[PDB]
Amino acid sequence: GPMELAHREYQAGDFEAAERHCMQLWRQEPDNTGVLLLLSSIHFECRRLDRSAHFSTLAIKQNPLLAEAYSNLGNVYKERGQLQEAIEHYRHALRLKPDFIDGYINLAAALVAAGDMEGAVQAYVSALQYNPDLYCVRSDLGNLLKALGRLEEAKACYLKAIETQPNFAVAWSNLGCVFNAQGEIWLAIHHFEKAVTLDPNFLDAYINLGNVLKEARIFDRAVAAYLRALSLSPNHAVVHGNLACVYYEQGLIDLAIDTYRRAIELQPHFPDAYCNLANALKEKGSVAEAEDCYNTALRLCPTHADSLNNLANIKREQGNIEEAVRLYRKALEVFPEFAAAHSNLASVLQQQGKLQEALMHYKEAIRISPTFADAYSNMGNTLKEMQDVQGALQCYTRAIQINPAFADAHSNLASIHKDSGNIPEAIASYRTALKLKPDFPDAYCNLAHCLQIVCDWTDYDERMKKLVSIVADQLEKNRLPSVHPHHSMLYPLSHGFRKAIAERHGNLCLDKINVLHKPPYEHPKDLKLSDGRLRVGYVSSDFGNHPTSHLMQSIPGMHNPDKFEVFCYALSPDDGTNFRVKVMAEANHFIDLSQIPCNGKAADRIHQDGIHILVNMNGYTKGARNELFALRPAPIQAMWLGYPGTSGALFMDYIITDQETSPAEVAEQYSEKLAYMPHTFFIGDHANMFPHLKKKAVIDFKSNGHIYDNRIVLNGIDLKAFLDSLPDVKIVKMKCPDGGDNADSSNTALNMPVIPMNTIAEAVIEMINRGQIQITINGFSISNGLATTQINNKAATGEEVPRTIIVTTRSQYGLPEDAIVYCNFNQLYKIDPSTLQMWANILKRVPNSVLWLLRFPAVGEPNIQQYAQNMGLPQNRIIFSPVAPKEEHVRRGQLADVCLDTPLCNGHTTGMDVLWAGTPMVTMPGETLASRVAASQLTCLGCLELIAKNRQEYEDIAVKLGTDLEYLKKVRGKVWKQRISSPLFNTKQYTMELERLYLQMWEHYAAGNKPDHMIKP
Amino acid sequence: GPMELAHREYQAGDFEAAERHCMQLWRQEPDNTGVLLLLSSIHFECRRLDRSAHFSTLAIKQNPLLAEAYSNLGNVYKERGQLQEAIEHYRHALRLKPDFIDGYINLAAALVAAGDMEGAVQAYVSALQYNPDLYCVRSDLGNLLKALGRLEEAKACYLKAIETQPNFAVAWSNLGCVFNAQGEIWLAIHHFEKAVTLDPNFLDAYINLGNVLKEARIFDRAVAAYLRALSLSPNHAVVHGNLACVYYEQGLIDLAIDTYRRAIELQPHFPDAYCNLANALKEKGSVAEAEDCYNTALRLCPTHADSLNNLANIKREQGNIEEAVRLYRKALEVFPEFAAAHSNLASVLQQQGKLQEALMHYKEAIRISPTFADAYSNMGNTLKEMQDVQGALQCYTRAIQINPAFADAHSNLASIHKDSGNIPEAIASYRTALKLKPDFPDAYCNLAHCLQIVCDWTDYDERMKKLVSIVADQLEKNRLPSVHPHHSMLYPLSHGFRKAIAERHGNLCLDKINVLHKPPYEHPKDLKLSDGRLRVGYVSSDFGNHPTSHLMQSIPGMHNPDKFEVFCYALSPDDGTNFRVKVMAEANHFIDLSQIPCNGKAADRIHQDGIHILVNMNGYTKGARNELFALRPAPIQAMWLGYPGTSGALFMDYIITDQETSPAEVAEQYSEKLAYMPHTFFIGDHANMFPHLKKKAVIDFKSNGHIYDNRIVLNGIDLKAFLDSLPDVKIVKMKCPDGGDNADSSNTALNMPVIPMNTIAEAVIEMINRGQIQITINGFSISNGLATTQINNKAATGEEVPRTIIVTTRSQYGLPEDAIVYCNFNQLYKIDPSTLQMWANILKRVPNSVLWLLRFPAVGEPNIQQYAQNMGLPQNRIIFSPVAPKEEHVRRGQLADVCLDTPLCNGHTTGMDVLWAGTPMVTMPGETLASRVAASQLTCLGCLELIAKNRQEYEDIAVKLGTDLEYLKKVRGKVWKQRISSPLFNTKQYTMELERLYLQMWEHYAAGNKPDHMIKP
């Protein structure tokens, strides 16, 4: 009867005896249908919930005042859906029994199943308010509040639970999840380790420990945590992805490959492993599978951004630009924050040329991710390409400030330094990069050139041999050489190599021009409508104040308009030089192009101009645009008066030279043809701008009786107008080797004016000795060369003729008055150790000898000083002046005795300067056109003995001259005597022969014949 | 006057205005000398503590009631030493001013400077009791209590401090130290990271974080923590050691080398880095520096144990045993817990031979460190050497249970399995090791032999070729071959290889014997005092129940005592065999040696015995001690009646053979000489132990008229005594090829007794058919061969002659009555695929043919079954019986038709069995002595046609016999006819010729001549 062994069968889990005995109870004592609801609890477990409703109906019918029937009613109703009604009678419950426990619990279970979190929380908190011991209900507020987001209020529920039942191993792992959210890992992995020590058959702790151990980049322990995690469940398919990532990061690639296969096997629909597997393959070589795998990944989802980026990159290694373009577009528009896509897109845009939008991509990429040095470097490349921002230099610097492990970035900023004039910084940076990058050739090449600028010849021949190997090797790799085409003529290389580099750069230029597919010009054969007058075109980024201009400036002045019409084309923007003033002054057609960035319309403009002959000044130099010639608009395009070494363009037509400078033997290394001058291709210009030095004057020396022209002299546009003012001075007929013929002229320029001790002359001597600015006697402003720029800079800038009378002194530069002056003025870098041995020998073999140099740049003086005594010379036998502007630059040479040449590559213009000054010059031909230049001027002067054939000959000639002072005197003589009679200055004749040669060229072309070596005009 | 801007100058830190103004105060208001004690505070900072005492004297004199004077007095006194007096007036202080603060603090400073911790603690706690705000005093109780050791009471002082002033960055790092002590690292590295985030110019936190990060075996983060630690202090010399250890553990050896150099540079006296640097070098090759560095280390301290161990190891690679011995002794006695030294010492003891003490070293090494698998493996080697503990097998198992990555350990336990009879386990283990160790040759060799036991011929020729390569390669490495000398004659190898392996093992044996330096014996030339009688010695670990004994047992029975005296030497302990009973029964001198483990006294005993001729039975087999012969005590030592293949000992003297088995052609591969028998060297023994089978009897077959001897037969010691009891049975003269001569004898053994249907004979037939135990008629116990062991095991063990009458039936083993029976009984492993093809061919070419085998072992039946039908045979054409003891083993052969030989290596004894049984035998000579054996018996029988010369001949002979049933009948005839007349059994004659040959040998030796091939005796 009344007995709970039926409830004990419930304790066992059966009903048979319980149900029969409770059936007996109903048939004897129908008051406990609640036991039938316990039977209904069996029914909940055994789905006989219909009979649960039956028993509940009985209970409520007999006993309408027991909540528990409604409780079971709610359970079955939640199974059957009416959850709001379940709440209806649950809240109808808990009224008659306010202290009922399980009602609150499963009520909250109901509401949370309905989405009404807030009510559920109050339900639990009420339950706790009644009972503080439910050590497994607290953890459920944990699971709830932490889901709501009120983290810091959660972490106070777990902790009560833990301290209540300290073996509880589910209130440690959850608490681990909270600390993992707030960001403090070093506690999160602690709490997890406690919660597997307490219960080593628990799976969630093992995973979560794996995850937070592969964020903190511990790896070995992460592997162990996973391995146990799956030996509790061996087919998890999500462990199998992470485990691969860890294997891939340790460096054990093959295990990653295998495990990824296992993961995709276990679960097929899985884009991430596809993408990541693709990366795993791509780094192992089998790229074909990589592309296919990326295809599969975006098949399962066309929006998975990572695959888009990576596949686009893969295509971009095959130049398939637009595919990658649109794909990067897609990824960026899906994910508007993905910095890597920004970088990749911008770089391919750099390939596209358009860059300002690429610039803003670089900007925004940094904006989202402020720690991406690579983008800084690349955007610096962009800026340097589009302008010359030194803030871009700062951008490089920022990259180093983020990571100083970039050899390439250092190389960049060093390039800016070299361009600017910051030589030491560039040196330091290149050494930095090389010490970080042993293998980098380009840094080696630029560093080599910089060292050659600074005369530091440590390991000299070693450097040349290594870099010769590098250029040969690089050229075989079918890439553009590191060595700049201009820099070549410093290093000793084969003719084949120098040519090959020239064509490398030339074909590079035509490679840019080709892709534009601009229509060809049908220009040629226009000599009839031309009405017998030809058209000549010159281009120059150096119309203005530049040595090239200083050399060709007067050529348009006497061009024949009858059969020729001249067209000027200034590439550079104007700078208001008097040079340029003259340029458009006598120009038949002056045309500016600084307003024309378009290669097209410029070339087209040439096409309408229909210029028969087109001539270049620039070639490969700083600041030129040769592609304008690469399109070959005009029928004939030629090199002239530029750096030697043919471009190898194959569309250039005619070099300019003479019979001897470029003989036919070396015609194998010049891509294009030859044109021969009667005397030389290098035309003088000084007499036009400085005819004032046509006559001179010299003061008396400290000693008398002997002649000393080259210590202190007098010059001035009105020096002759000053001679008559002199009361009585000596005028000796200075003689070259004469013998008595042709010296019996008026000899105004052939008689040296030697002023002996004269009262006015002596006086002005003392007022000049003290460094006084200038004095004026007899209406003539008496001046020194040193302060002519202060008197009027324009007089010395060459553009303006000087007016005053000029005096110069050896000791004005501290020069002793009785030392044999050997000198030169070429830029410093064109000197090597070997030639330095040559000056060493000659200077040693003369006691009262001095070598004159320039500190241009000044940073090389210590280094040359070192080797000066290393081969045993004092630090007083060599004297080096500072840089002086053009007029006094050429004037101060007149004080010197004998200049000497640099055999590595001659001074193109400077040798002309000293020759015009009347000082002698001596050289030995090399083997390159540049090297061969120097003898050309002498041959035009017809002084063959001043040319050597071997290095020993050079030394012997220098010794023979330096010893033979008398012959030196008459050498300065005959140089002076020829310079007035030389054909080097008949610019009338030069233009004459030049135009005549053009007409011969054009008449040969009128036959349509191929260009050929037009020897013997 | 009264003004504290003097105290403000103190705030600045100067005294000038303060001291002058307070001097003015004293001269106007002499009441504040305490300001002069503030001046004295400057004095403490500026060592003017004498004037501090002066000012204190003034203050106490005027004001004897201010503690502060005593406070300054205590400070200076602590400087001056009287610290107990400092406490004296400090405790004298704090009386008038009980609430003074700084007194408590510096009081505790005083006491802790005196070693009285306890009082100091109360001092601080009192201070706190007054003021709860001293956020920088709590941390000092921390520093104190944690030093006392009351950790868990410390951690409650820090925590109050931290929450008081949460920026305090010295109460985080210390608290980190506490958690590091209690053992919970994952909190320790947390608290440190908080305490560098709060203060990044703090050094102790950076080190301590480094240390606890290289215990938890994080490495990269440890490197970073150190690198910053020294960029705050760049010459620390203790960081520089740990940093090396971390570099060495990452695998970046060279950085470790460099940093160790840097550490020893910074600080010279530093043994640990020396020792550790030595390890760093030793693993890089430069061992010479390693020894020197260890020398330096123990120079700075002769007690540094680690260096002792490592240096001793280094020496032990140079065999310098005693040096390492004493050194390990030193290290162990310094450090009585160092398990590694225990292991090393024990292993070198294993080299020393003495092992029981090495055993206890292994025990104690495990005892201290219960997780050292290596020692388990080694001690297992020891135990297996000294006894055969299978608990040692368990020791191996324990090693795997610690780490199953030991291929070598698996190989060991597999060796035990193979020795025991646990073949499958050995197979599994060897495969396990090989799959873990691709490179291991020895496992390959043993695994190969095991496979050959189990007939699994997968990849057969591939295995032989690979292992042939391995043995050649191993032999060139000047090491003992993996292949056991006995196992060789299974694999096909060159004569050179087999010889070479024999000498490898032989020289190995003499290598053990050599080191003992036992004095040589002056035995030889003793034939005069011998009085004309020679002495012969036999050794055998197989006197007893063993085939060798079963073969030579009766030889001592007829040895001539006149000129020879025999000496027996049983190596093995007695087992009470009737064999052994006979052995000492007719022995001239039976000598036991199981009581003699000493090689010495045994060899000496032989020396006093002065035995002229010494003969071996064992050779390289299981259970032998050949070194006893390696010492060559007796003048002459010979191989005889053992496994073929000369030992290559070079101290063996004479093999035994005949003219034909071992012709002179192959004498190149036998180290020692030859001795020729008139007929053969292999002597029969059966007639002595089984003369009962001299006569037989056969029952009638199912069919009549034709003769069928080989289906059901009768035997028994009294079968002839039973023949007369028969009323009337047929006695047909069974004929070999006779022709009518010599067959006209009494023919008792030449007439086959064929019992036709006879009432008593038929009756006993039925009472045997049902498997009845046995029946008895006419006083004769009628028995079947199958139950003879149950009747009396002794009768079948060979030792005892059977008594009853024996019957046997073909179907008694299920054999069909009319199938051609081809058979053999050799051990299973002496079969290959190729010969199996041979039986395949012959068995195919006869319809009613059956092949009889044995399942010995039974594990090979499935594998042979596979290949049986693989070459296409049914599973009923081959029948295999179980193992049967000796008597019925040889008896059941009589039912068979024709036995067949295994050409790989013949059955030494079994062929003799079947020959004695009268069944025919056929073979083809191989090329090794073992192979050549089989034809020897036939040649002694003079039946040459039963010998083949090629494999095809073998098949053709088998076909010709199997087809020719009549000739088969007369073949069984002539085998039976010869076996009674054969010289194979005249043991009288065998001993005769044997002794005569000894005497010839000894008479040749009496001349002192070198041993030579004594052909033609």
Numbering used by the authors:
A (entry chain A), B (entry chain B): 23 to 1039
Paper text:
A single pair of enzymes, the O-GlcNAc transferase (OGT) and O-GlcNAcase (OGA), catalyzes the addition and removal of O-GlcNAc on over 3,000 proteins in the human proteome. OGT contains an N-terminal tetratricopeptide repeat (TPR) domain required for substrate recognition and a C-terminal glycosyltransferase family B domain (GTD) that catalyzes the modification of protein substrates with uridine diphosphate GlcNAc (UDP-GlcNAc) as the sugar donor. Here, we present the cryo-electron microscopy (cryo-EM) structures of human OGT and the OGT-OGA complex. This mutual inhibition between OGT and OGA may limit the futile O-GlcNAcylation cycles and help to maintain O-GlcNAc homeostasis.
We next determined the structure of OGT at an overall resolution of 3.69 Å using single-particle cryo-EM. As previously reported, OGT formed a scissor-shaped dimer. The TPR domain of each monomer consists of 27 antiparallel α-helices, which stack together in a right-handed superhelical conformation with a lumen of 22 Å in diameter. The conserved asparagine residues line along the lumen and align in a ladder-like configuration to engage substrates. Structural comparison with previously solved OGT structures reveals that the catalytic domain (GTD477–1046) in all structures adopts an almost identical conformation. Mutations of four conserved residues at the dimer interface to alanine (OGT 4A, W208A/L209A/I211A/H212A) disrupted OGT dimerization, based on size exclusion chromatography and cryo-EM analysis. Similar to the previous reports that showed the dimerization-defective OGT exhibited lower O-GlcNAc transferase activity towards substrates, here OGT 4A mutant was less active in catalyzing O-GlcNAcylation of both TAB1 and YTHDF1 here in vitro, indicating that OGT dimerization promotes optimal modification of certain substrates. We hypothesize that the dimerization of OGT stabilizes the mid-sections of the two α-solenoids in the dimer, allowing each solenoid to transiently reach its more straightened conformation for substrate recruitment and release.
